[PDB]
């Protein structure tokens, strides 16, 4: 029993984190096989309208200092792919895990290994918000920290950290260096779009609550998908789709509560609040657990 | 910016987790140097009044199957210390970190690496509640999972998981096998004592909120320690001590808000609620961050 914001074990990623210095700028990089991936804004000084092709043309391999733990790695090549810098090094990472690069959809969750000067600091879970930001915990020097999922023993990297927006939320790229969202890696007026709540995740979390013995919010009613989405839109919730309903199938089956039955509970909670009760220790509706996250944690899968 | 329930990177612990089988009972063990530590109830069948000295007298080394990843470890000795079984094995763990065993005080936090069949599943943060339980996330097979902190590169183990209580909370021991709280490792009528909120942690978390730009709960008032503890007791909060005030010193200094000034904020929040506002994304007062946790995460320390 119990339900917690659970990250994946981070050891496989910790062995990949290095420090990348270029001039006076230091940040983190990801060392897989003989390549080190890091944000390209490492080659910047100050930055309002940087021309990165020019900035990189003016660099040489010896302008890049890469340290893995205590050993310095020799850079033997450098190139840029979108907003990521790729530094070829002379030695392949002996700790390289089985891995893949993936570009996730909004509403999906991942583990973040926050790092400073190439040294892991902590691990936490978060979600790609519908507005393509993440509500992380990042200080100066955290750029290059990665987000990931782990299936079987394969690490799927899905996020590298680049920037903190003025509202305190965070922007980054997939590991091919494509930003999530409309953002660009320069100092300009940038702001996240309006955000919405991830409906399918809230429902998943209600199922986890039921699985853990919180039932007070259940009712006998049912709603139509169309009637529910009318209420969703009113409270700034993402529309619920038949894909979402099918994804919730196994949780619906394990609890015996039909998805559209749970939607009637969610409607009431949106309309009437919680009246001083809590769900899974929260006074607010939680939306950073996917259906997969719930099944994993209430079923016990390992990696 | 940002504030998240952050666990320590778990790699150093992942390399220590093994599976320990005795008959039909399988659980996790912790492999440090040439010893494997696990809950002694692994040698039980069913268990209401087990006599563990007798149960262990009847065992031999070959009744214990220890698997580390894919390799089976040869048990060459066995003994019991309090509620922990210690199995001497023929091979010292080559991945043993620098480590220590520590017995923590209630209100202190730690990272939990949940494991099944010796394989890490996830990592999360929690606190030793004042009633010596933890609100973890554990399923059958999780016994033997450990809780830990990491300072510099030294892993301080402070919890091994033994049991789930009927209320869904969790009971365990230090790594010397002494239970936290009044619990015993047998099937009987056991229930946690009444719990209280960790006042010093709530104040620490209010400081983190201020550090991250949430100020709406601040006021111009101040309170006496005595007057505050009168309100604390009313709302089932632990008394605040001068030790607690001194521990909050650095957060008080960094924000310029005196501790007793923050206590007046907390008093108002206890009396008047939040009136539909949130702090650090929470509608409830959070009490599982220590002052040290706040400083670490709002200052950027690594391990
Ligand atoms: O030496 C070092 N110098 C600099 C950094 C650094 C650099 C940026 C950065 C980079 C770019 Cl290209 C654009 C940018 O714009 C702001 C957002 C908006 F522009 F979109 F509005 C910001 C940055 O956000 N952080 C940072 C701080 C706190 C949390 N998370 C990231 C750090 C470093 O880590 N080390
Ligand atoms: O093969 C396996 N058999 C058994 C287990 C197992 C065994 C116990 C256990 C052990 C003892 Cl000694 C006493 C006990 O009493 C209950 C609490 C109270 F008694 F204090 F009220 C319970 C246990 O709680 N869990 C468990 C489940 C879910 C979450 N966390 C722990 C598992 C196993 O993991 N594998």
From Swiss-Prot, chains A, B:
Domain Peptidase C30: 1-303
Cytoplasmic side: 1-303
Effect seen on changing residue 130 to H: In strain: Omicron/BA.1, Omicron/BA.2, Omicron/BA.2.12.1, Omicron/BA.2.75, Omicron/BA.4, Omicron/BA.5, Omicron/BQ.1.1, Omicron/XBB.1.5, Omicron/EG.5.1
Cross-link (Glycyl lysine isopeptide (Lys-Gly) (interchain with G-Cter in ubiquitin)): 5, 88
Annotated active site: 41 (for 3cl-pro activity), 143 (nucleophile)
Effect of residue 143 to A: Complete loss of 3C-like proteinase nsp5 cleavage
Activity regulation text: Inhibited by pyridone-containing alpha-ketoamides compounds 13a and 13b. In turn, alpha-ketoamide 13b (tert-butyl (1-((S)-1-(((S)-4-(benzylamino)-3,4-dioxo-1-((S)-2-oxopyrrolidin-3-yl)butan-2-yl)amino)-3-cyclopropyl-1-oxopropan-2-yl)-2-oxo-1,2-dihydropyridin-3-yl)carbamate) inhibits SARS-CoV-2 replication in human lung cells. Inhibited ex vivo by michael acceptor inhibitor N3. Inhibited ex vivo by compound 11a and 11b.
Catalytic activity: TSAVLQ-|-SGFRK-NH2 and SGVTFQ-|-GKFKK the two peptides corresponding to the two self-cleavage sites of the SARS 3C-like proteinase are the two most reactive peptide substrates. The enzyme exhibits a strong preference for substrates containing Gln at P1 position and Leu at P2 position
Subcellular location: Host cytoplasm; Host Golgi apparatus; Host nucleus
The protein's assembly and partners: 3CL-PRO exists as monomer and homodimer. Only the homodimer shows catalytic activity. Interacts with host FBXO22; this interaction promotes the proteasomal degradation of nsp5.
Protein role: Cleaves the C-terminus of replicase polyprotein at 11 sites. Recognizes substrates containing the core sequence [ILMVF]-Q-|-[SGACN]. Cleaves and inactivates human TRMT1, preventing tRNA guanine(26)-dimethylation of tRNAs. May cleave human NLRP1 in lung epithelial cells, thereby activating the NLRP1 inflammasome pathway. May cleave human GSDMD, triggering alternative GSDME-mediated epithelial cell death upon activation of the NLRP1 inflammasome, which may enhance the release interleukins 1B, 6, 16 and 18. Also able to bind an ADP-ribose-1''-phosphate (ADRP).
Name used for this protein in its record: 3C-like proteinase nsp5
Native species: Severe acute respiratory syndrome coronavirus 2
Gene: rep
